[PDB]
Amino acid sequence: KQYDREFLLDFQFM
Amino acid sequence: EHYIKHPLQNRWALWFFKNDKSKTWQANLRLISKFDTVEDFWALYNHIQLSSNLMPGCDYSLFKDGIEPMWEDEKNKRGGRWLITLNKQQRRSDLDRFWLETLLCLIGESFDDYSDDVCGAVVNVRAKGDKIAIWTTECENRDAVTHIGRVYKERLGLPPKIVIGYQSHADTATKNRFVV
C-alpha cells in the first residue's frame, strides 16, 4: 500500500 | 469510495521530545499517538503543534510501530540517517513544509522496494538551525540507503548542485557513508 503525495494531501481537510 | 478509511502499509507512532532538564534523554521522550490510516494521520497532524512553532531543544519523531526513536534500538543500531541541516527562520516557516513532506514519504511508502529499510524520521528544532533526517536499518545496504536518498532529495525538491549526506549511527555516536 503506497500513496502519492497529491493523494495524501487530498485528505488533509475533508 | 471515501467513506471507508485508507489503511497505511505500516502503523506509525509519533513521538515528541521536550528538552526539560529533568530526567535522562530517554525520559522527556514521549509517545503521543499511533495511527495506521491516512485519515487518522491527518487527524493527528492537523491537531498538534507545528514544528516551526516548537521551542528550541524539542523533537518530533515518526517511527514504525515497535521501533523506538533511538540509536540503540535493534532496528537502528546498525543503521543511519539521511541528514538535512536547515537555517533558522524568523519568518518563512519552511521547516514545516520539509517535515510534512518527509512524513508523506514515510506513510506513503515512497521508497518502493526499500521502504522496509526505513525506520522513521526525526525533526530537531534547535537554536542554531533545525534538522530533519530519515533513519534506515542497515547503513551497509548500499542500494537501499542510496535509493531512499535519491527519492528523498527529489521529494524535497533539492537541486542537482546541492547533495545530502548519510551518516551511520555508530559514527554519529563516536563523515557521510553516502552522498546523493
Ligand SMILES: C[n+]1cn([C@@H]2O[C@H](COP(=O)(O)OP(=O)(O)O)[C@@H](O)[C@H]2O)c2nc(N)[nH]c(=O)c21
Ligand atoms: C538521537 N539521539 C540523541 N541523543 C543524545 O542527545 C544529544 C543531542 O543530540 P541531538 O538531539 O540529536 O541534536 P543536538 O545536538 O542538536 O541536540 C546527543 O549528544 C546524545 O547525548 C541520543 N542519546 C541516546 N541514548 N540515543 C539516541 O538515539 C540519541
